[PDB]
Amino acid sequence: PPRPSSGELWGIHLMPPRILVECLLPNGMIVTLECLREATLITIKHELFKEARKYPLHQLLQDESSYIFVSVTQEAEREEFFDETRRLCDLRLFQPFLKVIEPVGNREEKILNREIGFAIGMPVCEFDMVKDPEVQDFRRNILNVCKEAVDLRDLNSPHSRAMYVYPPNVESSPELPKHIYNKLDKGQIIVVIWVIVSPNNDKQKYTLKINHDCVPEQVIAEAIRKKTRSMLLSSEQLKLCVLEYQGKYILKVCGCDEYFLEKYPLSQYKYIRSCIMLGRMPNLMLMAKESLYSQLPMDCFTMPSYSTSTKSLWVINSALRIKILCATYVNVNIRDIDKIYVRTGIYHGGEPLCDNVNTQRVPCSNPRWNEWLNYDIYIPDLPRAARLCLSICSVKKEEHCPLAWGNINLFDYTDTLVSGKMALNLWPVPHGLEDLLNPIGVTGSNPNKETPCLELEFDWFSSVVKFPDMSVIEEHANRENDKEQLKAISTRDPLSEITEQEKDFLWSHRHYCVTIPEILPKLLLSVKWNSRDEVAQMYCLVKDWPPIKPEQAMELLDCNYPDPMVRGFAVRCLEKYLTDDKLSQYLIQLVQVLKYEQYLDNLLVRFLLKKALTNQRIGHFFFWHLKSEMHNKTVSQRFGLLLESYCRACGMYLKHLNRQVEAMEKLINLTDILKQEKKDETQKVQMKFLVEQMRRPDFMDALQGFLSPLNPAHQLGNLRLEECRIMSSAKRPLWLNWENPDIMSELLFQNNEIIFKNGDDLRQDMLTLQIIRIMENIWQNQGLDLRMLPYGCLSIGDCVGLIEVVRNSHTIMQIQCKGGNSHTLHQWLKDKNKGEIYDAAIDLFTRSCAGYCVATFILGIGDRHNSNIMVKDDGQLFHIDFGHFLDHKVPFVLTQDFLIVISKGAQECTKTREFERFQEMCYKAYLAIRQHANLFINLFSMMLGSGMPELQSFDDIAYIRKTLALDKTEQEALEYFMKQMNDARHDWIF
């Protein structure tokens, strides 16, 4: 099992400077050697064999080059330390000892296996010992997706490898909004290409002015032409040279690892489109093709070690029946709680297929029922995604409360109906759930066998009952001026109530609906899933359904749509239509919806793992998102088996990921010590402790020269130690600083700053920030020029995360503290940006302020404290720390402060020329989100699975409807919002 802390030994956070390690020599002897914690295994082995000749049986000991160290780790496994560069402190030992042996078996296999294990945080050999067919099949079978992806990466290998590793960071649509054309100078952008031309950084500029819609090759071509101008050749001799040498070069963003490897327009690359908006100068570096292509690890994925009568369901003429026999364990007062009973029910996702049926009451002391339970459903009428939910329940009659819960799939991954005896280790009830059953939670037995175990039995029939193949089902299955009614439901939100009248209305016109694809979600929640007959018709519909937007397909992957034909349609809509761009931005939701899938092997994971191993930028976040949720016991096995399959095939990025994982562990451990044993000590004492530990060679090596988890394009080079510090908070977050080793850091990122926080759940912030991005994206691509700042935030594990530092930004509180008044906020922004920038920086303030008032309101994150709003020097306003608000629990944050800045004039301003615009911005902004309500509802709907206290049911999400005023006419909703805007007019420390 994973190790529970990041300590250097079991029990101990930090080894002291010198450790006595007990060495087990291969001749038999025990020698007790004093080692430095930082010491390498090379130096330990050398000092061991020196001192080993002072002991008996020394004549037996061969050259130390012939031997390797073996010890037990905190994960309770035998690690063979082949890499003897590793330090003592970094080994993660159980107890301070080492065993000298001669190595055995296949070398590269064993090393790779440890490497896969370290990144995941679980040993590989633990999967090898799992006694489960679905698990062992998943492992053998999933390698097919991996075989595809490796075969896809290596087609036209030089270019296609580079594309994997440095995918173009590009928008979804080439067409750019009209408000962005007007940033350009008569259809054209001024660019600077740079070149290195000698061992020393002898730098040369090339300022070009080129069509925004040029490809990188054409941008290169213009560079070549400019160099060639001094030379005297024909026009058709320029051409010859330019043409051949267009495709020996690659453009790269100065300051980070972002390459222009693909034939997209220059404007479609996010970095350029950002420069156009901000009105900045692009600096790209020119760089030789072979000089990148050589750096590419010539990689190759070789395969690992690991590689009866039936009748259809509809031939069986009976009602479903289950026997509840008895339970092993009940944890109960036996005084206050008298009796206990097993509540049961058959569910299709969250909706139940038939009445619930209970057992008789028994005394807690002897929990044995031994009773056939009768379900009000025919066996054929069972759908594919049907499953049993049950729980043991207590009584005071007067008071019912659930003790342990569990759900079981009624069909195997091989579509076999369950039969015979079966034990089920139950689960503890979640925190604030008082429902008798928990149909939401994972399906299967508890890995922790030290829990209440419920025995039960299912009927045996002549043969092995299987669910029929699709072709058999396809066989069986085979009004005017109410189209105003159909379209009018197909626009209404996914959480809106659809009456039994409107259900019967939709089902009746099902065949028509094929015209209006977007209605499928509404249509499906009208089907009676407890009808073999209705079901089979739908299946024929879904099979011949037109495609739909991904944004809308994503609805069909949440809890409410557990049917595999419904999900398979959805996944197919993504396979075809979802762009890498778009994928990346909804990756949080897509991973989380893997939970709701019934089986390990399925179309969605196969889709995701393909895309993850096809594109490294998706792969990186794919890894983290998954790894972060590994501590969670319900999902660890699946996500583990998945992260295993990825790490196997991902290539050389595993080594990059290990260095990240290692760097985070040190930081976890470092924080843990300050949080626990050094908790009381003053700021001076701690800071003294921190710099001492941060200077050590084990720390410096592990946390220098690795890629940021927030962004793998950003390299983190040498620590600027003098600028690293512990923050003020009682959780002790770490402000870190890095030199940027990129050759031309000066232009873009001289300093990478990251906050490392231990102990606070950052998933809420992570989900909030994602949504602010999409609100900006919707506004921007519709012509509404509102500028948000969804800074970087990543969860790396259980209340451990990183935060991007927005530079040159101060909280409103900061500004207040220095002076004070309304005019001082203005004066600061004027003070900083004067002349022909003052006009542009107020125009930035307005737009940012508007967006974080509309988004703030719709999300219900209004009435925010001043300390939580920041301003960049250039004038961009943004909100921070969305966790700090949703934990603690006026609609808008608009203040007379900011109104002075936007109007930029007389203090006594009710309305102004400038103000009126600002207001019209908000209305257009607000109305833009209202018209995209459905997407945000669905984004939140897919994150119900995820354990978050704020998103546990659809009832929580319904606040969004109230803010958007979806029920009311559009015109009305403007009025509703305008109320809130007006309404939000008007000792600060306490």
Binding site: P1, P4, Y55, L57, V72, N333, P352, E399, T499, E500
Partner: protein, 212 residues
């Protein structure tokens, strides 16, 4: 004009076919399948809603059970006895979550001790294998001063195993101490949570603007 979060509250552990009326932006909800149906009323073969509702009561499904409307300072005493239980519980769940992790830790540290001892026992087999030929050579040569160094070392090796074995065996006992402590925390949780269910339905109260 009740909310969608208040229909579900009133259908919870109700028999199927319970019914009630609501205002729309009227809506006749119902309990059947273990669900919440909607059958809206447009405000029509019958000359009333009042006349209409009364027939069905006697897959069109019967209105078995009705919801009724009916069921200051002696509720301000009970909210005080909801603030005690809710603190006491969260404190138990705090202690439950810790103990849960700490048990899981002890269970790893045993597996580890097992694998550690397994290594050290192999060392005894290693040493007895190799020492065998050298012990005999020293017997022949009658060199006790050197057989003492071989035995001394073995005395530390076999001695070190015992120290680890009690370390393991001491933790195995502490596990059973912690496990029991864990069963009693969960016994005291499950015997408070029901109380906090039917002292919540109590929270529903008359609506006045003033607080406390």
């Amino acid at each position: 004009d009740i909310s969608r979060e208040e229909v579900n509250e009133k259908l919870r552990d109700t028999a199927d076919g319970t019914f009630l009326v609501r205002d729309a932006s009227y809506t006749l909800t119902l309990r059947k399948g273990g669900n919440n149906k909607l059958i809206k009323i447009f405000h029509l073969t019958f000359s009333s809603v009042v006349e209409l509702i009364n027939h069905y009561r006697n897959l069109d499904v019967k209105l078995l059970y009705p919801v009724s409307k009916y069921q200051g300072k002696k509720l301000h005493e009970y909210n005080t006895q909801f603030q005690e239980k809710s603190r006491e519980y969260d404190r138990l769940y705090e202690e439950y979550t810790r103990t849960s992790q700490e048990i899981q830790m002890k269970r790893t540290a045993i597996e580890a001790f097992n694998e550690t001892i397994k290594i050290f026992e192999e060392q005894c087999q290693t040493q007895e294998r190799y020492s065998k030929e050298y012990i005999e050579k020293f017997k022949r040569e009658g060199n006790e001063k050197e057989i003492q160094r071989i035995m001394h070392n073995y005395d530390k090796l076999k001695s070190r195993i015992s120290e680890i074995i009690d370390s393991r065996r001491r933790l195995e006992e502490d596990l059973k101490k912690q496990a029991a402590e864990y069963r009693e925390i969960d016994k005291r949780m499950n015997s408070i949570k029901p109380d906090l269910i039917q002292l919540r339905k109590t929270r529903d109260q008359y609506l006045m603007w003033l607080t406390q």
